[PDB]
Structure 1
Amino acid sequence: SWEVGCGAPVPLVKCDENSPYRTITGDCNNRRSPALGAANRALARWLPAEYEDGLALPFGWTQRKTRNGFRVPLAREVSNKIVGYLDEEGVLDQNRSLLFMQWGQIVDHDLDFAPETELGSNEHSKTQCEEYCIQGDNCFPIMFPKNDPKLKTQGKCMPFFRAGFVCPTPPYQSLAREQINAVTSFLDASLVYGSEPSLASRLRNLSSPLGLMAVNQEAWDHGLAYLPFNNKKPSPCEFINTTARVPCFLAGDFRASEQILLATAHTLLLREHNRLARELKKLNPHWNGEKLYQEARKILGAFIQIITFRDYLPIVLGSEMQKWIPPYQGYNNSVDPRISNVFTFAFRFGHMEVPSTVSRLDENYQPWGPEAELPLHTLFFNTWRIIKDGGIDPLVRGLLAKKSKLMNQDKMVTSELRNKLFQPTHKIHGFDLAAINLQRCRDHGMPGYNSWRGFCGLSQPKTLKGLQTVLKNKILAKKLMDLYKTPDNIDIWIGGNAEPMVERGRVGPLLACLLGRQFQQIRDGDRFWWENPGVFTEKQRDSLQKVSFSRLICDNTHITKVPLHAFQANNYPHDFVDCSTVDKLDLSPWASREN
């Protein structure tokens, strides 16, 4: 009765009964529907796609084609009028460390990646899009409004290329266009290990049966590993400093070097795998390389799950946590674990938590050198500042001692991302992540703000006064009505992020609902969830309960003082204790077995 078949790329693998570990692809997690949550398949649709032609063309593609009787505003004009601000004074979150932002980006990279269409190779398509700003097939350029300064300094557009879609990637089909999730839907440390067998093997050290991940052979951090380099050319990390010539890192996720603190967090996770593999080898000398790798991978997946659900989500969702994510009751094989298309926009709330600067701090939590503090835009695809300017410890100290940006209806996205974003192959620090998010909402066929309010059982404002009430902000509602003309047309990214945050949380009610529903699904629909009986033993679960980001730092850096609650705002020295007082992960329950 349905077109359920379509999975034409079809990374098809048969499933082995009673297999002890996760697949790299996420296949075989659900026994009845083994592709559920596997990588390189369609993002789930919680609601039907909304395209100007019903099938594939974004709203805004055809100038004369209205949405609900009104032209959709230019993404860059919404960015300029609503999202932008000048003054960074007073914008920081007084109760969230910068690790709060950074953990969000890490979790996001574990869960979803909808990359730009490949569209063949060695052609004049990408250059054409960038050079002449001509909309066509996959070229969906972000056009500058008449009063945009970038129209004066940067040409007529910011190049933008439509996301990849499942069955054919160049041609189309009879159903609506469905974008791809290139990573595993499960919270499974796919950002460390990869979501594809080829990358997963490339990341491993298969020279020794020690179960290790490959490490950098060119540079070391006071005896501790860096990720290997990606020696693919051209390299955006080389591009931004051709004197230093330091390549990007190779990780489980394609995007690991996008900014210096994401590369930092990736480095901690790689180190933690190798520490666990060494410690398991000492405990279990007869375990082979495959077994050591899998058991360390399983522990690192559980770490990521526990930090996320115990420490992170409660301070994102605040009062809505118990509504959307009740205490775990067990694996439910009827739950759809696939990441939804809308979730990939909902989780971009993080863009409003990114502050304008990154600091390096020394062994006394004092400024590291004469340029301790640097503008964020100079740190896009920046790996040389790690290798050649103190390794990761000074950056990790900044992650603990400095703050996230607080979402603000009058100060949404810092100009470091809104005007100075660097994109690989596009040469300039001149892109706008907010405009890109809005253009991508349309590229993906997103239903508008009121469709999602209805989905979440919330009021659907129809008038300026109704929107002013929901947003608790007259001027913001007025600016959104002036541009969108009806709240039905407001793009979900800006509408969800415009709502005032729930008590004890950092998102409003619409985003709490969309995020909370997704995180409930990826937990309840995961046969390898850490708390599911038989994944770990009772004694292993008791040991895992004691994981902390503070212990991760103590174990995989030379930092000797850390806070106990690393996601809150912490000040040195008052909130910092000796590493020796921080709980350890007791691996004794991983003994092959005893009597």
Structure 2
Amino acid sequence: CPEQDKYRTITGMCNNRRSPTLGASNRAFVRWLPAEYEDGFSLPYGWTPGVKRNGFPVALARAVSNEIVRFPTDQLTPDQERSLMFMQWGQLLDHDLDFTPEPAARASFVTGVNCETSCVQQPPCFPLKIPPNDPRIKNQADCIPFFRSCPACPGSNITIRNQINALTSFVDASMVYGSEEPLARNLRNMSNQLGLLAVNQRFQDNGRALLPFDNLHDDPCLLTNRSARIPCFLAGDTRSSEMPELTSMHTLLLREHNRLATELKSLNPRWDGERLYQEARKIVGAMVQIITYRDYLPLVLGPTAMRKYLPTYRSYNDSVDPRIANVFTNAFRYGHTLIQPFMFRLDNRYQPMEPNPRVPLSRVFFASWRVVLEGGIDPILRGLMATPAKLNRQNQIAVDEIRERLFEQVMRIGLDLPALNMQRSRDHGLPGYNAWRRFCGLPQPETVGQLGTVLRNLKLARKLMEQYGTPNNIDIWMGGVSEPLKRKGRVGPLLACIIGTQFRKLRDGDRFWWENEGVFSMQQRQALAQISLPRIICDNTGITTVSKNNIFMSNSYPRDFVNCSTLPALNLASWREA
């Protein structure tokens, strides 16, 4: 590929010149540990009845969720040092890194069964069976729908099943620009030479841009309010409409791009649309990296694991594998423990905003109509900044808005996201808890007592042994979030290692890392160090009072807030060409 280049490819191709497919979209996940399947190459554990895993029956994901994850919603413990923006950035970031495609439901027409409707365990379905005396699904002939992720090698003969990452592993803001050339151009405004992204043509947000509408014949967003007829949005990642909080962050970065391309045009009139697009794309990409590694990741891992797994950056290394590990797709779902059961919306005074200031999540999923018709994104972003995240306690894992009522407005039955996570790890043949402990150099408990010591919680170690029988079988997500949080962090040691290691490779194996020599000039790097997420909010919204750094720690108004006039704006003076 190009002997020399300046901007990254959309697909991530040829970031590593010695292996041009590393980190590129639509490639199989890399495996930090060999896959563990029931039959050794494809069938997930729990597929065939009576077939044990390490001498113990496989536990129903829904049962583990009922007995371990369920807790009384109203007793939720607020996090005194994490805003709800901390959770939301984790979701948006994840949508930059991994998306595991699944077969579309319509493929079941002249083949197999419809996993949306049927509870028959047949390819490509892997439905979650309902345990006895379930608190919500009292019919054991029912099930929670589940599609198996598409195999990396379709069909195939004796090929250990693996899964595909449809996104660029690099932290390159691909959730804004896309991971494939057709979508990338579809997202772009191709009617002039300004290098802008396409914006909505039917609706604005107090004079400011909204994401364009995507076209889905069976649009889930239209089901959330039939009279509004507001479809889902279009962005670099296809999940942009899952939540209005997520939508708001997509919309924010879309405005930031068009704001940068505008200034760069006035700054360099000779530049054409492509040049403006690529330059603004490169800044946004660096902004995501800065916010991620400077502000976000230290609050996920904590100082100890941060210094250990993300030492001081040196330079690019073309020997580093920058791909997303299959286990990271499940391990980075720790954020589900941070989810509050409501969407909070505030006004310019940071007070509850009418119509609805405390909407349960089960009525915001795919509710794009709320962004367009209930006040835009400013009330949402304000709620994300001035609302504490949910703290993860060993007996308060995840709320029921995602454990009982996930997508119930667009699904025949409410889904159980924690249970989906564990079923998903089995779908991907991920090794168990102790397998990843060892991989991370951590002690591996065999007995309830040793597990009790690891968790510093004899009670939880007991309920885990009752469900799983052996710590070797604890699904990686359940075990990851069950561990006590490290000092000033929000994950245990196991997830600190998996998450920390992943982002190390994404930094050291990225030739376009914003600090790597040649990417930016010295004056440009010093200019980018000044950016912050609160400043991006000031530049592209009607909000004039925003969190003070660190935004992910600030979470109470007016204690942790300042006026926008106090923060410095990004200085594009060094982007001037003679």
Give 1:269-348 correspondences, 5 Å limit. 269-318=253-302, 319-348=304-333
Give 1:80-99 correspondences, 5 Å limit. 80-99=66-85
For residues 164-203 of structure 1, the C-alpha deviation after alignment (integer angstroms, 9 at most, x for no partner) is 12122xx233220010000000000000000011100000
1:36 corresponds in structure 2 to 22
1:248 corresponds in structure 2 to 232
CA distance, structure 1, for counterparts of residue 411 and residue 157 of structure 2:
31
Quick one: which of 381, 384, 389 aligns to 1:396? 381
Quick one: which of 62, 70, 82 aligns to 2:56? 70
Quick one: which of 168, 176, 183 aligns to 2:160? 176
For residues 433-484 of structure 1, the C-alpha deviation after alignment (integer angstroms, 9 at most, x for no partner) is 0110010010000000001000011000000100000011111100000111
Aligned pair in 2 of structure 1 residues 316, 140: CA closer, same or farther (>3 Å)?
same
Quick one: which of 538, 543, 555 aligns to 1:559? 543
Segment drifting more, 383-392 vs 366-375: 366-375
1:447 corresponds in structure 2 to 431
Cα drift, residue 373 of structure 1: 1.2
Aligned pair in 2 of structure 1 residues 124, 405: CA closer, same or farther (>3 Å)?
farther
Quick one: which of 518, 531, 555 aligns to 2:502? 518
1:258 corresponds in structure 2 to 242
Give 1:188-587 correspondences, 5 Å limit. 188-318=172-302, 319-422=304-407, 426-428=411-413, 430-565=414-549, 566-587=551-572
1:117–1:165: 8 Å Cα contact kept in structure 2?
A: no
CA distance, structure 2, for counterparts of residue 583 and residue 554 of structure 1:
10
Cα drift, residue 155 of structure 1: 5.4
Which letter does structure 1 place at the counterpart of 2:398?
V
1:24 equivalenced with 2:16 (yes/no): no
1:9 corresponds in structure 2 to none
Which letter does structure 1 place at the counterpart of 2:517?
P
Which letter does structure 1 place at the counterpart of 2:336?
H
CA distance, structure 2, for counterparts of residue 158 and residue 365 of structure 1:
39
Which letter does structure 2 place at the counterpart of 1:365?
Y
CA distance, structure 2, for counterparts of residue 363 and residue 485 of structure 1:
53
1:11 corresponds in structure 2 to none
1:149 corresponds in structure 2 to 135
Segment drifting more, 177-186 vs 563-572: 563-572
Cα drift, residue 424 of structure 1: 8.8
2:29–2:165: 8 Å Cα contact kept in structure 1?
A: yes
1:187–1:305: 8 Å Cα contact kept in structure 2?
A: yes
Aligned pair in 2 of structure 1 residues 424, 365: CA closer, same or farther (>3 Å)?
closer
Cα drift, residue 154 of structure 1: 8.8
Cα drift, residue 352 of structure 1: 0.3
Cα drift, residue 126 of structure 1: 7.6
Q: Structure 1 vs Structure 2: percent identity of aligned residues? A: 57
1:7 corresponds in structure 2 to none
2:287–2:531: 8 Å Cα contact kept in structure 1?
A: yes
2:112–2:124: 8 Å Cα contact kept in structure 1?
A: no
1:6 corresponds in structure 2 to none
CA distance, structure 2, for counterparts of residue 423 and residue 57 of structure 1:
29
Which letter does structure 2 place at the counterpart of 1:538?
M
CA distance, structure 1, for counterparts of residue 372 and residue 410 of structure 2:
23
Which letter does structure 1 place at the counterpart of 2:203?
A
CA distance, structure 1, for counterparts of residue 7 and residue 409 of structure 2:
36
For the residue of structure 2 that corresponds to 1:94, the secondary structure is: strand
2:82–2:553: 8 Å Cα contact kept in structure 1?
A: yes
For the residue of structure 2 that corresponds to 1:150, the secondary structure is: coil
Which letter does structure 1 place at the counterpart of 2:433?
Y
1:160 equivalenced with 2:146 (yes/no): yes
2:37 corresponds in structure 1 to 51
Cα drift, residue 125 of structure 1: 5.5
1:88–1:356: 8 Å Cα contact kept in structure 2?
A: no
2:37–2:45: 8 Å Cα contact kept in structure 1?
A: yes
Which letter does structure 2 place at the counterpart of 1:588?
A
Q: How many residues align?
A: 576
Which sections of structure 2, spanning at least 5 residues, go unmatched? none
For the residue of structure 2 that corresponds to 1:453, the secondary structure is: helix
1:12 corresponds in structure 2 to none
CA distance, structure 2, for counterparts of residue 137 and residue 129 of structure 1:
9
For the residue of structure 2 that corresponds to 1:421, the secondary structure is: coil
Cα drift, residue 231 of structure 1: 2.0
2:115 corresponds in structure 1 to 129
Cα drift, residue 417 of structure 1: 0.2
Which letter does structure 2 place at the counterpart of 1:585?
L
Quick one: which of 87, 93, 100 aligns to 2:86? 100
For the residue of structure 2 that corresponds to 1:397, the secondary structure is: helix
Which sections of structure 1, spanning at least 5 residues, go unmatched? 1-14
For the residue of structure 2 that corresponds to 1:342, the secondary structure is: helix
Which letter does structure 2 place at the counterpart of 1:308?
T
CA distance, structure 1, for counterparts of residue 420 and residue 189 of structure 2:
38
Which letter does structure 2 place at the counterpart of 1:375?
P
2:362–2:409: 8 Å Cα contact kept in structure 1?
A: no
CA distance, structure 2, for counterparts of residue 287 and residue 154 of structure 1:
64
For residues 237-289 of structure 1, the C-alpha deviation after alignment (integer angstroms, 9 at most, x for no partner) is 00111111100000000101001100010000100000000000000000000
CA distance, structure 2, for counterparts of residue 126 and residue 554 of structure 1:
51
Cα drift, residue 52 of structure 1: 0.7
Which letter does structure 2 place at the counterpart of 1:581?
T
Aligned pair in 2 of structure 1 residues 54, 284: CA closer, same or farther (>3 Å)?
same
CA distance, structure 1, for counterparts of residue 101 and residue 331 of structure 2:
17
For the residue of structure 2 that corresponds to 1:88, the secondary structure is: helix
TM-score, with structure 1 as normaliser: 0.95
1:92–1:405: 8 Å Cα contact kept in structure 2?
A: yes
CA distance, structure 2, for counterparts of residue 270 and residue 153 of structure 1:
45
TM-score, with structure 2 as normaliser: 0.98
Question: What is the Cα-based RMSD across aligned positions, in Å?
Answer: 1.4
CA distance, structure 2, for counterparts of residue 589 and residue 387 of structure 1:
37
Cα drift, residue 369 of structure 1: 1.3
CA distance, structure 2, for counterparts of residue 378 and residue 118 of structure 1:
24
2:260–2:280: 8 Å Cα contact kept in structure 1?
A: yes
Aligned pair in 2 of structure 1 residues 578, 336: CA closer, same or farther (>3 Å)?
same
CA distance, structure 2, for counterparts of residue 124 and residue 367 of structure 1:
51
For the residue of structure 2 that corresponds to 1:562, the secondary structure is: strand
